[PDB]
Design a protein around this ligand. Sequence first.
Ligand code: CL
Ligand code: CL
Ligand code: CL
Ligand code: CL
Ligand code: NA
Lengths: 4, 99, 99
Amino acid sequence: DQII
Amino acid sequence: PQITLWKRPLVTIKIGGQLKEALLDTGADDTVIEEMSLPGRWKPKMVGGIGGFIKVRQYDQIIIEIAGHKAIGTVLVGPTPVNIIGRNLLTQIGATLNF
Amino acid sequence: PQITLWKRPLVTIKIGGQLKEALLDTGADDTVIEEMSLPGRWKPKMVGGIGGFIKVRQYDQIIIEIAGHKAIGTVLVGPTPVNIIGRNLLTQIGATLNF
Ligand SMILES: [Cl-]
Ligand SMILES: [Cl-]
Ligand SMILES: [Cl-]
Ligand SMILES: [Cl-]
Ligand code: NA
């Protein structure tokens, strides 16, 4: 997962 | 509402009966909140951001209000710089990006 | 367009004569692109988010085309895991969040  | 992006898109959320500030973040798959107490069991997750990966606690089926809109879904708890509302809950409140 | 948030909001950009894919990111103050060359002067910067900080090169007054809309602004170049279009350029193409 990507949190940006 | 229509939220322009000249300032950070910060809104008030309510989780566990408490008000917090959070960022509406279309770049985030998931919702990540600062350390707090949530009910239930949690599962492990790692999530990646611009500086690398962090470990978080995944809590499912959490009741959360976002700018007055009710949602029930997954909340990750861990060391985030800012509370982030990601796409898993932005879709529940019917948010779109428009240009 | 109206972009729903069921999946990552990825668009094609043109920057420095190159086509790239990038994420429309309301949670980012700044625009951060993977390593590439850009013309003119630059200065070093640290930018942070989940996982910590990365060092980047800051180039000002760079023209980009974002899903066919031209904008000018600051672009940060460095080891970001994802190309991100942040608020500094989202405003210029008239992007809003709507719910
Ligand atoms: Cl606004
Ligand atoms: Cl805007
Ligand atoms: Cl170009
Ligand atoms: Cl220089
Ligand atoms: Na320049």
